[PDB]
Ligand binder design. Sequence first.
Ligand SMILES: C[C@H]1Oc2cc(cnc2N)-c2c(nn(C)c2C#N)CN(C)C(=O)c2ccc(F)cc21
Length: 292
Amino acid sequence: NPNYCFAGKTSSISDLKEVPRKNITLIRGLGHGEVYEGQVPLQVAVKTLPEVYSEQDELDFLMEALIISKFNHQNIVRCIGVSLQSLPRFILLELMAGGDLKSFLRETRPRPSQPSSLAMLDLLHVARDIACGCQYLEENHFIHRDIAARNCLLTCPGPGRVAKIGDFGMARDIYRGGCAMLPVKWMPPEAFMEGIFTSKTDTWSFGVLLWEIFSLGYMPYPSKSNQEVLEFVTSGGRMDPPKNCPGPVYRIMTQCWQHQPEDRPNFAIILERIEYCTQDPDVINTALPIEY
Ligand SMILES: C[C@H]1Oc2cc(cnc2N)-c2c(nn(C)c2C#N)CN(C)C(=O)c2ccc(F)cc21
């Protein structure tokens, strides 16, 4: 069975915490593989491997469990354990009741009915949370490869929410696919041209995540196809600021999108800049757009 090394330790499937299947109860679907809300009473999200999947899918599923299980950080979803000795195979994750970040942003947009549903500080706190997760990954020499709103989760809908990175499927595939499935809209030039990935890959992607956050859940590069983005970005093209986006926040995005990786900030610097934004009244007092 496949092994996995993180920090200074190597791990195997035997190291995963097996939870007896009889202790696990599915409660409801959460938005499907398929994902359920479950109980172990400990509340969990249950990631399932469809029995109709192949052997490579099995190994990938397993590797993802190993990956998440070896992290220890507040802004990365916890793995409660697995149930691998019964079918279908389960991975048990920390239940994040706020759901994925993209859906949250789109559904929580300030409206005439909910004008104060979200403010700039809430968005900055989400960004800080994920940047803190990214900093942990960077300092432990782990490259995520698909930092994007769809891959982040929230502990809860309301004000005390904490954002975490919740999916590691792309780092898993590369660890051991199609062109039209590559997240090119989140990738820097050296990644989609040369297949070169470093921590500065994730910096670029984080810039795109920031745009997603401050646009309140829009698809990056509106109206552009993947190939059009590839050509646009290679030629020096960059997204405009999201509506009402404060200059200091947009500045972090454009720094994340520097053409040369050496010119992009590491996550320690990104965190410092996000923190300064949270201190600036002119940033956090900026009203978000209210769609009618
Ligand atoms: C593997 C899965 O994990 C969780 C999903 C949810 C909560 N907690 C965890 N751990 C969740 C979702 N929506 N809702 C309403 C809930 C709830 N409650 C999102 N979802 C359906 C996903 O598949 C998904 C999306 C992105 C990501 F990073 C991980 C996951």
